Write a protein that binds this ligand. Sequence first.
Ligand SMILES: [K+]
Ligand SMILES: [K+]
Ligand SMILES: [K+]
Ligand SMILES: [K+]
Ligand SMILES: [K+]
Ligand SMILES: [K+]
Ligand SMILES: [K+]
Ligand SMILES: [K+]
Ligand SMILES: [K+]
Ligand SMILES: [K+]
Ligand SMILES: [K+]
Ligand SMILES: [K+]
Ligand SMILES: [K+]
Ligand SMILES: [K+]
Ligand SMILES: [K+]
Ligand SMILES: [K+]
Ligand SMILES: [K+]
Ligand SMILES: [K+]
Ligand SMILES: [K+]
Ligand SMILES: [K+]
Ligand SMILES: [K+]
Ligand SMILES: [K+]
Ligand SMILES: [K+]
Ligand SMILES: [Mg+2]
Ligand SMILES: [Mg+2]
Ligand SMILES: [Mg+2]
Ligand SMILES: [Mg+2]
Ligand SMILES: [Mg+2]
Ligand SMILES: [Mg+2]
Ligand SMILES: [Mg+2]
Ligand SMILES: [Mg+2]
Ligand SMILES: [Mg+2]
Ligand SMILES: [Mg+2]
Ligand SMILES: [Mg+2]
Ligand SMILES: [Mg+2]
Ligand SMILES: [Mg+2]
Ligand SMILES: [Mg+2]
Ligand SMILES: [Mg+2]
Ligand SMILES: [Mg+2]
Ligand SMILES: [Mg+2]
Ligand SMILES: [Mg+2]
Ligand SMILES: [Mg+2]
Ligand SMILES: [Mg+2]
Ligand SMILES: [Mg+2]
Ligand SMILES: [Mg+2]
Ligand SMILES: [Mg+2]
Ligand SMILES: [Mg+2]
Ligand SMILES: [Mg+2]
Ligand SMILES: [Mg+2]
Ligand SMILES: [Mg+2]
Ligand SMILES: [Mg+2]
Ligand SMILES: [Mg+2]
Ligand SMILES: [Mg+2]
Ligand SMILES: [Mg+2]
Ligand SMILES: [Mg+2]
Ligand SMILES: [Mg+2]
Ligand SMILES: [Mg+2]
Ligand SMILES: [Mg+2]
Ligand SMILES: [Mg+2]
Ligand SMILES: [Mg+2]
Ligand SMILES: [Mg+2]
Ligand SMILES: [Mg+2]
Ligand SMILES: [Mg+2]
Ligand SMILES: [Mg+2]
Ligand SMILES: [Mg+2]
Ligand SMILES: [Mg+2]
Ligand SMILES: [Mg+2]
Ligand SMILES: [Mg+2]
Ligand SMILES: [Mg+2]
Ligand SMILES: [Mg+2]
Ligand SMILES: [Mg+2]
Ligand SMILES: [Mg+2]
Ligand SMILES: [Mg+2]
Ligand SMILES: [Mg+2]
Ligand SMILES: [Mg+2]
Ligand SMILES: [Mg+2]
Ligand SMILES: [Mg+2]
Ligand SMILES: [Mg+2]
Ligand SMILES: [Mg+2]
Ligand SMILES: [Mg+2]
Lengths: 64, 48, 6, 84, 96
Amino acid sequence: PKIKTVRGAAKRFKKTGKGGFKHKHANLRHILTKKATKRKRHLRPKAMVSKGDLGLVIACLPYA
Amino acid sequence: GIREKIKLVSSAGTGHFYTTTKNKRTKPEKLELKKFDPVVRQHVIYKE
Amino acid sequence: KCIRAP
Amino acid sequence: AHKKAGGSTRNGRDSEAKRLGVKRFGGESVLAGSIIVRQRGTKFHAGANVGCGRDHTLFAKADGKVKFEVKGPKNRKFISIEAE
Amino acid sequence: GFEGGQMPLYRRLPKFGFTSRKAAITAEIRLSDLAKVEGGVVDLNTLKAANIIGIQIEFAKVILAGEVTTPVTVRGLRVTKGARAAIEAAGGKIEE
RNA sequence: CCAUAGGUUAAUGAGGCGAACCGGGGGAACUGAAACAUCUAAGUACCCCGAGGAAAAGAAAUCAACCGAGAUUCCCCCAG
RNA sequence: UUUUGUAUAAUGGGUCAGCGACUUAUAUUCUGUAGCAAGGUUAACCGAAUAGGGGAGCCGAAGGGAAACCGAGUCUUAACU
RNA sequence: AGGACCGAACCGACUAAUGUUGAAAAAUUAGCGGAUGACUUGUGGCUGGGGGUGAAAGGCCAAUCAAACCGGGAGAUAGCU
RNA sequence: UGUAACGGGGCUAAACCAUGCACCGAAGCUGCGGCAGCGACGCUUAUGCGUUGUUGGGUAGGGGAGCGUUCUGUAAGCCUG
RNA sequence: GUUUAUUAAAAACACAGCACUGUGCAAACACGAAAGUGGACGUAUACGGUGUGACGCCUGCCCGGUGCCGGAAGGUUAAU
RNA sequence: AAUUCCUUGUCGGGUAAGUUCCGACCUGCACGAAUGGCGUAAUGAUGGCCAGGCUGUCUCCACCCGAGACUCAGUGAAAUUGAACUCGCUGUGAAGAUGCAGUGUACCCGCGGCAAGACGGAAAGACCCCGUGAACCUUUACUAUAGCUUGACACUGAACA
RNA sequence: CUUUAAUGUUUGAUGUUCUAACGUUGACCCCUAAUCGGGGUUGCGGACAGUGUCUGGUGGGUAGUUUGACUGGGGCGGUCUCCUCCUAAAGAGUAACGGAGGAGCACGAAGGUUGGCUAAUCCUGGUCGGACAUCAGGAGGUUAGUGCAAUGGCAUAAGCCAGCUUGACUGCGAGCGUGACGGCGCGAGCAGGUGCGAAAGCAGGUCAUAGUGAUCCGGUGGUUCUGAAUGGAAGGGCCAUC
Ligand SMILES: [K+]
Ligand SMILES: [K+]
Ligand SMILES: [K+]
Ligand SMILES: [K+]
Ligand SMILES: [K+]
Ligand SMILES: [K+]
Ligand SMILES: [K+]
Ligand SMILES: [K+]
Ligand SMILES: [K+]
Ligand SMILES: [K+]
Ligand SMILES: [K+]
Ligand SMILES: [K+]
Ligand SMILES: [K+]
Ligand SMILES: [K+]
Ligand SMILES: [K+]
Ligand SMILES: [K+]
Ligand SMILES: [K+]
Ligand SMILES: [K+]
Ligand SMILES: [K+]
Ligand SMILES: [K+]
Ligand SMILES: [K+]
Ligand SMILES: [K+]
Ligand SMILES: [K+]
Ligand SMILES: [Mg+2]
Ligand SMILES: [Mg+2]
Ligand SMILES: [Mg+2]
Ligand SMILES: [Mg+2]
Ligand SMILES: [Mg+2]
Ligand SMILES: [Mg+2]
Ligand SMILES: [Mg+2]
Ligand SMILES: [Mg+2]
Ligand SMILES: [Mg+2]
Ligand SMILES: [Mg+2]
Ligand SMILES: [Mg+2]
Ligand SMILES: [Mg+2]
Ligand SMILES: [Mg+2]
Ligand SMILES: [Mg+2]
Ligand SMILES: [Mg+2]
Ligand SMILES: [Mg+2]
Ligand SMILES: [Mg+2]
Ligand SMILES: [Mg+2]
Ligand SMILES: [Mg+2]
Ligand SMILES: [Mg+2]
Ligand SMILES: [Mg+2]
Ligand SMILES: [Mg+2]
Ligand SMILES: [Mg+2]
Ligand SMILES: [Mg+2]
Ligand SMILES: [Mg+2]
Ligand SMILES: [Mg+2]
Ligand SMILES: [Mg+2]
Ligand SMILES: [Mg+2]
Ligand SMILES: [Mg+2]
Ligand SMILES: [Mg+2]
Ligand SMILES: [Mg+2]
Ligand SMILES: [Mg+2]
Ligand SMILES: [Mg+2]
Ligand SMILES: [Mg+2]
Ligand SMILES: [Mg+2]
Ligand SMILES: [Mg+2]
Ligand SMILES: [Mg+2]
Ligand SMILES: [Mg+2]
Ligand SMILES: [Mg+2]
Ligand SMILES: [Mg+2]
Ligand SMILES: [Mg+2]
Ligand SMILES: [Mg+2]
Ligand SMILES: [Mg+2]
Ligand SMILES: [Mg+2]
Ligand SMILES: [Mg+2]
Ligand SMILES: [Mg+2]
Ligand SMILES: [Mg+2]
Ligand SMILES: [Mg+2]
Ligand SMILES: [Mg+2]
Ligand SMILES: [Mg+2]
Ligand SMILES: [Mg+2]
Ligand SMILES: [Mg+2]
Ligand SMILES: [Mg+2]
Ligand SMILES: [Mg+2]
Ligand SMILES: [Mg+2]
Ligand SMILES: [Mg+2]
Ligand SMILES: [Mg+2]
């Protein structure tokens, strides 16, 4: 039968042009007052998944 | 610990706010500061 | 009896 | 078999090592921005084309070669960038 | 995804975004496709008949990809700045 | 009291068995979740009732999207 | 066999013969190979039936953006050196 | 008269020896307790598994009992050998 | 438990120190024969030979290349009283 | 007297006796989706549950805690 | 003390000599009044201790009678078993050697005996730990839930205060 | 409007009485040659009781489960994240139930900037006044100070005082450090708008290194980005934040 997507992975990663994955940074949900603006500013833009992690992500998203 | 979080809200009609802490015990008077409002793109009084 | 009993 | 009660230590603690020290040595060619030293005080002081960040990091303000020197009346160590 | 019990990567990162239903009913057409319609006019219907876009597509856009080398009237499609230039350069008429 | 219940007789039918499939009435747990309770396993196993050569479903108080389709069932897609 | 390490006084086997353990299905990715190639390929089904028909679809030739949207760019930002 | 006494049958099972691939998956031999009773025994009946029954030992429920047996879920699961 | 604190015999050097030259001694090195991997270089691409250099202990484990077994076609063929 | 059939027969269990407590009879209580049945063809001098354990002499202080019984003004508080 | 750790407490009795026993003391680690206290005639295959009698229990064994054991004839198992041409010692060594080193001793093969070793046989250690194992048991662990209990609405009406 | 009557009306509670639902494991009759059942009749009880649905309490009676790891065996004890020093072998890093201490904040100034200033301790003299207050001079030279541990720093002070202030800015960010990763850190410069300074300049918190908590779920404000026929809306997204 068809492989099933890990649906929680599909909600957190998106496949980019050369087949990397973009994700949203951790640490910008709450406890924001104590964090510096510079730190929060650099967490706003999406980031690429690292080489160590790509295996794990790809396994979760066979139809990405 | 004892310091509470507060919003400093723009006196311009925008929603914009900064957030910070205050020792409410020692300094009961309301914090007012001119800060940059990025919605209007101007330094303006913030309050609270 | 138990070998090497408790 | 008798076993004597142990006791305990009140020590056991330590902090994570901070990876301070020299990152680029004398003569090494750096791009502007390159961290040259992480330090706790100004063990080293900023010379020409070198900035001192808020944690006393010294970093290159220009592209060039790192140069260590002893300068001034306190014989303080300075780091500069020689523009190449 | 299992990492030995450490909070795994697909859980320690936040969810983001939402899925647009409108995206699913929108398509992109290339300049290479415009000659494939058979007729000359390129409506949403003629693209469907040429099997260029899906049956359920409501909106379409013509995009500078490939080349057009023939007069083509484009009717009721969005067209990119570059695509417009390309079509007009070949003698085409773009009409909203 | 009338009557009704009750009683007797006759006629007609049922009863029981049987593989799977089928409709219905009830309905687990191991297990998985690297523990576990929501969740899963699964409306599965199993019990029970009923039927037929098939059953069930079925002729829009259905979809659709301002264009249209036109009962039910089954197959491939849509789509992990 | 298991171990840092076994002649080990650690495990297993009395012997022989026969049997006895990485499979199958479907998805997915990569390698090889073959076909065709900006295209490739059809499913169910139809069919004098491994042909032929069937292109419904699917993958590919465009991306960026949460999205509207724009598009060889796009997002970010009032705007980018 | 008697949950009276001594003591066979009958019902038990305190001690020792033997036996321990037994004559026997609980016995034999020598002693031992009860022996008109809350006794013992034949035949038949009833109570069914989180259930029975228990003068209570988690005892007994077909040589099985801190949840019988048989079939099924079932190739449970086994980061272990 | 038995000499039992040179491995034994035995040794007054067959001990120890110094100097020296011989010799023994390994699956090390060399010689002779053979096989294979990889690289270079030219024959010349069916990728073969040729030359040259070098390498070839191996568990887990990765890679490469084969043997044999039963069954299908080739096979109403071929072998076989 | 009883008991671990098959390593324990005892100081264990039971026991007459004692006490607390429930129970007014369609009893309490128990088995039972229920009907019903046992309790009992009994009726508080009876029946159930609990502890203690012939008999003799006896059984002291504590109601703060946890239960149980009684109260119900007030506070709090469900569906509605 | 069926309770006392210290403890063989101390004192007395009994014995030549008594960590046990009996009497007593009270310093009750840690008795105590119906999860009864103290006592108690009788009773007990009940626990402890002392006597008389009695004896192969023993000093310390001897002899005898029977059944096996032994030999012959007939029948004919079993556990175990990597393979064995299966010695001692001192060393060595996965650390306790028939098997390694060194050395000593030793002609080949039965039968009756004995059990020191073959870490002998037997049962994938019950102890112990581990497993994000199991069971059953406990409770003011968590979450549920039968039961019991509360009220609302329904079955459910009338009249008057 | 604050108090307060009367009437009407809508309700709720309470107490009586009733009978006709309902109960009867009271009597009698019949089905009937029947201690079941049903029907009839008559007493008693009576809108109670009882049952259904909903609902609070109670509930080891029963069920499903959980009850951490490290550990010189396990238990008991101690520990678990973060900062500083040593161990650590002169780059980084480096273990033990090794040796020693700290943190889970504080501060609208204790932040920014301009201007100015310079410590401890001792000695001598001096009213109350001493070993130690404040004053003066000398010696001394940081033996002080640093909001809080330790280390490294600090006089151009980062230490002390004052004026003016909000850069404890918003968008970004060449380039580097440090991490398996999540991530964490340092950063010139660019745009906008600001503060201090005559000006060069400095300022994106604090001498630096602790003062912390992923994701999920949800809350608050903003933003039309989305909006399941269409217009809206709900809900979702995005930004800020709890
Ligand atoms: K660097
Ligand atoms: K389950
Ligand atoms: K598991
Ligand atoms: K081992
Ligand atoms: K063993
Ligand atoms: K494959
Ligand atoms: K291929
Ligand atoms: K059972
Ligand atoms: K299985
Ligand atoms: K007995
Ligand atoms: K009390
Ligand atoms: K009380
Ligand atoms: K005691
Ligand atoms: K009691
Ligand atoms: K008594
Ligand atoms: K030897
Ligand atoms: K032996
Ligand atoms: K009546
Ligand atoms: K009622
Ligand atoms: K309970
Ligand atoms: K240790
Ligand atoms: K040890
Ligand atoms: K200041
Ligand atoms: Mg947010
Ligand atoms: Mg010992
Ligand atoms: Mg198509
Ligand atoms: Mg039938
Ligand atoms: Mg599980
Ligand atoms: Mg039909
Ligand atoms: Mg070992
Ligand atoms: Mg060896
Ligand atoms: Mg062995
Ligand atoms: Mg051996
Ligand atoms: Mg083992
Ligand atoms: Mg074996
Ligand atoms: Mg074999
Ligand atoms: Mg008698
Ligand atoms: Mg018996
Ligand atoms: Mg006998
Ligand atoms: Mg007797
Ligand atoms: Mg007798
Ligand atoms: Mg027990
Ligand atoms: Mg049995
Ligand atoms: Mg069970
Ligand atoms: Mg199953
Ligand atoms: Mg199995
Ligand atoms: Mg000797
Ligand atoms: Mg060689
Ligand atoms: Mg050679
Ligand atoms: Mg070699
Ligand atoms: Mg090799
Ligand atoms: Mg008796
Ligand atoms: Mg027994
Ligand atoms: Mg016995
Ligand atoms: Mg008792
Ligand atoms: Mg009460
Ligand atoms: Mg003692
Ligand atoms: Mg004495
Ligand atoms: Mg004596
Ligand atoms: Mg005494
Ligand atoms: Mg007592
Ligand atoms: Mg009392
Ligand atoms: Mg008693
Ligand atoms: Mg014979
Ligand atoms: Mg030895
Ligand atoms: Mg012999
Ligand atoms: Mg013997
Ligand atoms: Mg053995
Ligand atoms: Mg084992
Ligand atoms: Mg155990
Ligand atoms: Mg339980
Ligand atoms: Mg379970
Ligand atoms: Mg542990
Ligand atoms: Mg170092
Ligand atoms: Mg070093
Ligand atoms: Mg200053
Ligand atoms: Mg400061
Ligand atoms: Mg500080
Ligand atoms: Mg709408
Ligand atoms: Mg709608």
